[PDB]
Amino acid sequence: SALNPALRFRDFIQVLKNEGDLIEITTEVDPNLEVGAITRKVYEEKLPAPLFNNLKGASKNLFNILGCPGGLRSKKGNDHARIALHLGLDSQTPMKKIIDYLLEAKTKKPIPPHEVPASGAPCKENLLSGDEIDLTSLPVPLLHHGDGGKYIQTYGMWVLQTPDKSWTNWSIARGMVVDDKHITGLVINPQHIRQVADAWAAIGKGDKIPFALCFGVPPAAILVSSMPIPEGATESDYIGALLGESLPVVKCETNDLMVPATSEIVFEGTLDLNDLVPEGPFGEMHGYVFPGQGHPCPLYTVNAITYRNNAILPVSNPGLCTDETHTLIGGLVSAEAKQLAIEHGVPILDAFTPYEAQALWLALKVDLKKLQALKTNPKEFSKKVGDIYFRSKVGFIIHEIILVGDDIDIFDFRKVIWAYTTRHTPVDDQYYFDDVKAFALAPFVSQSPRIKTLKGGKCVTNCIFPQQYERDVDFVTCNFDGYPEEIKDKVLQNWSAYGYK
Amino acid sequence: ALNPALRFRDFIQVLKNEGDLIEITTEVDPNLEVGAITRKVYEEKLPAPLFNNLKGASKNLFNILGCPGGLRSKKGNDHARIALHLGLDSQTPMKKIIDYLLEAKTKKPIPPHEVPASGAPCKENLLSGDEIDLTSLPVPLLHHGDGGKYIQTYGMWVLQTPDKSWTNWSIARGMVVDDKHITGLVINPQHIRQVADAWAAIGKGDKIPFALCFGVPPAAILVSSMPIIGALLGESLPVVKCETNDLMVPATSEIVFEGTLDLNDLVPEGPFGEMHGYVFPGQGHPCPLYTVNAITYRNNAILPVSNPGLCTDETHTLIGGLVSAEAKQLAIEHGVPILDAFTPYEAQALWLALKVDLKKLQALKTNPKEFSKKVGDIYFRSKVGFIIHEIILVGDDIDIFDFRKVIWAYTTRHTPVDDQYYFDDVKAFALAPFVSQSPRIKTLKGGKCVTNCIFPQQYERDVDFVTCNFDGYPEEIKDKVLQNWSAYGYK
C-alpha cells in the first residue's frame, strides 16, 4: 500500500474512503447553495465527507468537489482524523499530539522542493488558455446565502513572488469569481504591497503581477500554507520535513512560478493592484454573512488553466463550528502559540483554540508549579502573555486569551467553559489591550466603529485563582471523575447491578 | 389520581411510570457512593436512582431519592422532572415552565388547612429525646472533601416568630454535627433583626423552635427555592402541627425534624460541594447549632437529596430556572423589552441571558451603555440577581435555552472589556469561586458586569445577516437536502 495522504490529494481521498469516511454522491447536486447546505450538515453532524461526482453544469474533467476536507468525525476517538491525515499520521492521533508532531517536525532537516518536467506533472494533463476560459461555465459553488458571488478559492493556495524571488508567498486568502476571465481576492496584505508592486513595476509589469492559484494540492501543503508564519515564505522546506521527501513542483505555463506537481487544478494569470472590484461578502469562520458588506479588491485576470483528468475541487464552507477555519486555521494557531511560549519561556503545557468560540479564544494551559517559581502575579503575567501573542502574527485572529491551570483539559470545552465562568472575575480579571491589531472579520469588530481603526478590542482573561500564582490551592472537582478512584471503580462495577443499562 | 405537585410519592410514581426511575436494591454506601452515583446520573442524564438498600438504614429510616431535578437524555422532555414538580406534562419545555410559573403569580393564594395527626402520614412514627442518633442514620457524605454528612440538601426549614407575623420556608443546606445536632445558615442576616429578640422576649432566644421537613410536596420544595403554594396546586395544602412546637409542616412529608436553635452556639459548618462545581477543603465557617428533639417519619420513609456540582443538577435546573422566571417578571415590571430570560447551566448559574425584542428596543431610542447600566441597576440590585455575576444581552435570533447559540452569540457579538459595563458597588455572591478565592470575599462588593452581545446598530435599525449553519439556509434548500439525504448515500 503506497498511499501517502500527506503527499497526494487523491491518496488522501482514498484513505477517507477506506476508513468509511467518504460518501461518493452520484445524485445531481446544484453548486448554488445545495453543496453548501450538504457540507454544513456534514460539518455539524460530523458525518463522512461528501465527494460530489455529479454537479450540475460540470464538464467531464471540470469538476468534482470534495466537501469538508477538515471536518470532524463522530467517533471521538478519531474526531480529528482528517486533520491527522493531512500530515500522514494515524487517524486516531488526537489533536493534542497532532500539534506536538508539528512542533517536533520544526526540528527536522528541511527538504527543499525539486523541479519536475511538465510530462511528470499530473496537473499538466490538460490546458485551457485565453478565449477558451469561461469561469462562469464552471460549477463554482454559491456556498452561503448572502455571499457576494461564487467562491472558487476556499481550500487552495495562491502563489506570488517578487522578480528576484527573495519574497515568495503561499496564501490561503479567499477567491471569488468576478466574470468569465477574472477572479478577486485580498492576497497581498497592505504591508507587502509596496515591496512587490514596485519590484514588478521596475520591469514594466507593475500592473500585471503574475500569480498562480492551485486547488487539490498535497494536503500537507494546504496545511502549512494555512499556518501563521511570516507572509513571504512558502516554507516548502518544512513541508518536505513533514513529507519525509522533496515536494515535487512544476513550472506554470505562462510564468516562472512553481506549483505543486500533483495539483488538481491550477489557475494562472496576472494581478492589477490598481484595478479594484467589489469582493464579497463571504460566509466566514465566525458564522456570519453580512449581505451588502463588500469591499474593493484588486482584479486577477486568469490567462491559463491546467488541470488533471477528472479534476477534484476541495471546498471549505466556513460558518459555525466546526469546519476547517477552526480545526485547521485555529488548530495551527494553537501549534504556533505553543511554539511561541517555548521560545519566550512561558510555562505553557498546551495551547488550543476552542471551536465553540469560533477560533476567537486561545486557551493556554499553565504549569502551575513553574508559574509559582516565576514569582509573578496575574496582572504582570497577563500583560506579558498578551504582549507576546497580540503583537505577533500568531495571535492576530485571537481576541481573548484564557489562562487556566494544569487541571483543565483545554481540548474539552465542557472543562474550558467551567473554568472560564467560575475562575475569573468579570472585567476585573481581564487585562485589556487597546493598541494591538484587531481582526477585521470579528463580527464585534466589523459591526462597530472599530472596523475603521482595527486597533484594540482584546484582553487576557486570568482564570487561575490568584493564590495559585504563589502556592497550591486545594479543591475537589464536583463531577463523577472527581471522586476517589476506588469509589468510581465500585460504582462502574455495580452499574448494571444497580439496574442501569 | 396521581398529583406529582401535591404528593412526593405521586411524583416518584410518575417517574417510575415514565421509565425515569431505577429502584436500587443493591447495597449502596452513603459514604461517597450515593454522591458518585447521582453525579453520573446527572451528567449522563439517566433515570433518577431510588436507593432502597443503604448501609446503616433501618426499615423506615431511610431510602434516598437521587437527582429529583436532574435532566433526561431525550431533549423532548429533558426538563420533565422540573415540570413534574408543578404538575405539568412531562414534555413541557423549560420556556413554558417559566411562563407557567409567571401565569401562576396572577392567581389567588389558597391558604392551607389543618388536618389531625392521624390524617397526616408524616406522623406514622415518632423518635424523641434519647432515641435520636443522627450518626446512625444513613446520611450521605456527598462530595469527597465535604466537612461532614449533609442530611439537608433537598428539604425545607420552617421558622417563625412567636407573633407568627414572620414565617419562612428555607432551602439552606443542613449538615449533621453529632448524634443530636445539625447546623446550617438558615436565616439571612437581614431577618435576624426580628427573630432573636422576639423569642428572647419570652425567654426562648436561647432556643428558637424550628422544623426541618424532607420529601415535602414537590411544589413546596420549588416555591421555597424560588426567589419571590396552594395557588400552584389548585388546592389547599394539608399541614399538621409539630409534636414539640406550633410550627405547621406539610402533612405528606416523608421525614420531619423538630428542635430548637441557638444563634450563639456557633459551630463549624462545611465545606460542601456547591452549585459552581467546587468544594474547597479546610475549616468550615461558624454557623448556629440546631438541637434535634423529635423526629416523625412515614413508614418506609424516603429522603430526597441534591448533590450539587458541575452542570446539570438541581442548583441549575431549579435555582437558576426560578431566577429566570423572576428575571422575566422583573423585565415586564420595569418595561424592559425582554422576550425570555434564562440561566445557562454551562455557566453554573452565574450567567443570566436576556433575549431582547430588537424592534421594541429600537423604539426606546437608547444605546448599549445606557441600556446595560439600566439593566444591571434593575437586576444586580434585586434579590434575583444576587447569584448572577454576568448578564448577557442578545437579540431575538438567539435561542437562549440552547447553549450552542448562547456561546456563539457571546464570543462573536461582544468586544472583550469594551462591551462590558462593570458594577463595583453591587453585592457579590460569596459562593462564586472567583469571589471566595480572592480578596473580594472580605468586601463582597462588585465583580459583576452586563455584557452587550447586541450589535450597536441594532439599537437603531435592523442589521441584516445570515447565520452560517445548516438551519440558516433558505427553507427550500434545507428541505431539498433533507429529502435527498438517503439518496445521496448517507445513513
The domains of chain B are located at 8-304, 318-472
Give Cα A50 to chain centroid, integer Å: 19
3-state SS track over B159-185: EECCCCCCEEEECCCEEECCCCEEECC
Which DSSP helix (H) or strand (E) runs through A462?
A: strand A458-462
Helix (H, G, I), strand (E, B) or coil at A209: strand
Amino acid at A368: L
Q: Is A2 on the interface with B (CB under 8 A)?
A: no
Helix (H, G, I), strand (E, B) or coil at A210: strand
| Technique of determination | X-ray
- Residues of chain B neighbouring A148 (CB-CB closer than 8 A): none
- Report the sign of the C-alpha dihedral through residues B83, B84, B86, B88, in that order: positive
B residues 236-275 closer than 8 Å to A (CB):
273-274
Measured between CB atoms, which of B279, B447, B466 is closest to A425? Answer: B447
Strands A348-352 and A114-115: unpaired
- Nearest alpha-carbon partner for A471 in A371, A402, A380, A343: A371
Question: In this structure, what is the dihedral angle of CA atoms A465, A467, A469, A473, given to the nearest 10 degrees?
Answer: -80
> Side-chain half-sphere of B473: how many Cα atoms within 13 Å?
25
CB B87 within 8 Å of CB B2: no
Q: Judge if the upstream peptide bond of residue A322 is cis by omega within 30 degrees of 0.
A: yes
Q: Which CATH number fits domain A328-470: 3.40.1670.10, 3.30.360.10, 3.40.50.12280, 1.10.1740.10?
A: 3.40.1670.10
Q: Is B468 on the interface with A (CB under 8 A)?
A: yes
A329-343 and A378-389 helices, crossing angle to 10°: 120
User: How far apart are alpha carbons B111 and B131 in whole angstroms?
Assistant: 35
Helices of type H across B336-474: 358-363, 368-380, 403-413, 433-436
Q: What is the DSSP letter of B206?
A: T
Using a 10 angstrom Cβ sphere, with 0-12 exposed, 13-18 middle and 19 or more buried, the burial of residue A393 is middle
Give Cα A441 to chain centroid, integer Å: 14
> Side-chain half-sphere of B130: how many Cα atoms within 13 Å?
0
User: How far apart are alpha carbons B286 and A256 in whole angstroms?
Assistant: 81
List the single residue in B with minimal CA-CA distance to A361. Answer: B411
Cell 448562547 belongs to which residue?
B406
Question: In this structure, what is the dihedral angle of CA atoms B338, B342, B344, B345, given to the nearest 10 degrees?
Answer: 180
Cell of B66: 437521587
∠ Cα B291 B295 B300 (to 5°): 145
- Nearest alpha-carbon partner for A282 in A448, A450, A143, A452: A143
Cell of A127: 490546458
State whether A37 and B145 contact (CB < 8 Å).
no
Point out the residues of A that are catalytic. 284
CATH assignment of B318-472? 3.40.1670.10
Measured between CB atoms, which of A25, A290, A360 is closest to B488? Answer: A25
Q: Judge if the upstream peptide bond of residue B312 is cis by omega within 30 degrees of 0.
A: yes
- Nearest alpha-carbon partner for B429 in B385, B373, B393: B385
Q: What are phi and psi of A238, to 5 degrees?
A: -75, -35
Who's near B399: CB < 8 A, 6+ residues apart?
Answer: B405, B406
User: How far apart are alpha carbons A423 and A425 in whole angstroms?
Assistant: 7
List Cβ<8 Å contacts ≥24 apart for B470-473: B470/A37, B470/A40, B470/A41, B470/A44, B472/A144, B472/A145, B472/A319, B473/A33, B473/A36, B473/A37, B473/A40, B473/A145
User: How far apart are alpha carbons B357 and B354 in whole angstroms?
Assistant: 10
CB B210 within 8 Å of CB B260: yes
Amino acid at A151: Y
User: How far apart are alpha carbons B392 and B334 in whole angstroms?
Assistant: 18
Burial pattern A117-143, b for ≥16 Cβ within 10 A else e, equals eeeebbbbeeebeeeebebeebbbbbb
Tell me how crowded residue A92 is: count the other CB atoms within 10 A of its CB.
13
A residues 23-42 closer than 8 Å to B (CB):
23-25, 27, 29, 33-34, 36-38, 40-41
CATH assignment of A9-314? 2.30.110.10
Smallest CA–CA distance, residue B211 to chain A, in Å, is 30
- Report the sign of the C-alpha dihedral through residues B185, B191, B195, B197, in that order: positive
Helix (H, G, I), strand (E, B) or coil at A434: coil
Q: What are phi and psi of B143, to 5 degrees?
A: -110, 145
User: How far apart are alpha carbons B252 and B124 in whole angstroms?
Assistant: 10
User: How far apart are alpha carbons A331 and A70 in whole angstroms?
Assistant: 11
Tell me how crowded residue B308 is: count the other CB atoms within 10 A of its CB.
27
Cell of A281: 461578502
Cell of A262: 500533483
A residues 272-291 closer than 8 Å to B (CB):
283-284, 286-291
Cell 504556533 belongs to which residue?
A336
- Nearest alpha-carbon partner for B393 in B418, B378, B376, B377: B376
> Side-chain half-sphere of B21: how many Cα atoms within 13 Å?
22
List the single residue in A with minimal CA-CA distance to B440. Answer: A425
User: How far apart are alpha carbons B311 and B317 in whole angstroms?
Assistant: 9
- Nearest alpha-carbon partner for B487 in A139, A23, A42: A23
User: How far apart are alpha carbons B417 and B435 in whole angstroms?
Assistant: 19
- Nearest alpha-carbon partner for A453 in A472, A478, A431, A436: A436
Measured between CB atoms, which of A145, A288, A421 is closest to B348? Answer: A421
> Side-chain half-sphere of A256: how many Cα atoms within 13 Å?
6
Which DSSP helix (H) or strand (E) runs through A242?
A: helix A236-243
Resolution rounded to one decimal, in angstroms: 2.1
Which residues on neighbouring strands pair with residue A402, listed in sequence order? Answer: A363, A461
Q: What are phi and psi of B342, to 5 degrees?
A: -160, 150
List the single residue in A with minimal CA-CA distance to B409. Answer: A357
CB B428 within 8 Å of CB B440: yes
CB A139 within 8 Å of CB A56: yes
Cell of B467: 447565520
CB A241 within 8 Å of CB A227: no
State whether B39 and A483 contact (CB < 8 Å).
yes
Smallest CA–CA distance, residue A484 to chain B, in Å, is 8
Helix (H, G, I), strand (E, B) or coil at B355: strand
Question: In this structure, what is the dihedral angle of CA atoms B480, B485, B486, B487, given to the nearest 10 degrees?
Answer: 50
Smallest CA–CA distance, residue A477 to chain B, in Å, is 5
- Residues of chain B neighbouring A24 (CB-CB closer than 8 A): 489
Using a 10 angstrom Cβ sphere, with 0-12 exposed, 13-18 middle and 19 or more buried, the burial of residue B483 is exposed
CA distance to A14, A102, A236, A476, per residue, from A87 (Å): 15, 9, 14, 39
Q: What are phi and psi of A64, to 5 degrees?
A: -100, 160
Measured between CB atoms, which of B281, B389, B390 is closest to A476? Answer: B281
State whether B32 and A290 contact (CB < 8 Å).
no
User: How far apart are alpha carbons A464 and A338 in whole angstroms?
Assistant: 19
A95-105 and A329-343 helices, crossing angle to 10°: 60
> Side-chain half-sphere of B11: how many Cα atoms within 13 Å?
33
Would you say how long chain A is, in residues?
Answer: 501
Cell of B126: 415518632
∠ Cα A284 A290 A293 (to 5°): 105
∠ Cα A184 A185 A187 (to 5°): 135
Start-to-end CA span in chain B (Å): 44
Question: In this structure, what is the dihedral angle of CA atoms A450, A451, A454, A455, given to the nearest 10 degrees?
Answer: 10
Tell me how crowded residue A319 is: count the other CB atoms within 10 A of its CB.
30
User: How far apart are alpha carbons A234 and A166 in whole angstroms?
Assistant: 11
Q: What are phi and psi of A372, to 5 degrees?
A: -65, -30
Question: Could you tell me the fold of the domain covering B8-304?
Answer: Pnp Oxidase; Chain A (2.30.110)
Q: Judge if the upstream peptide bond of residue B439 is cis by omega within 30 degrees of 0.
A: no
User: How far apart are alpha carbons A175 and A210 in whole angstroms?
Assistant: 16
Measured between CB atoms, which of A27, A450, A478 is closest to B310? Answer: A478
Helix (H, G, I), strand (E, B) or coil at A273: strand
CB A180 within 8 Å of CB A206: no
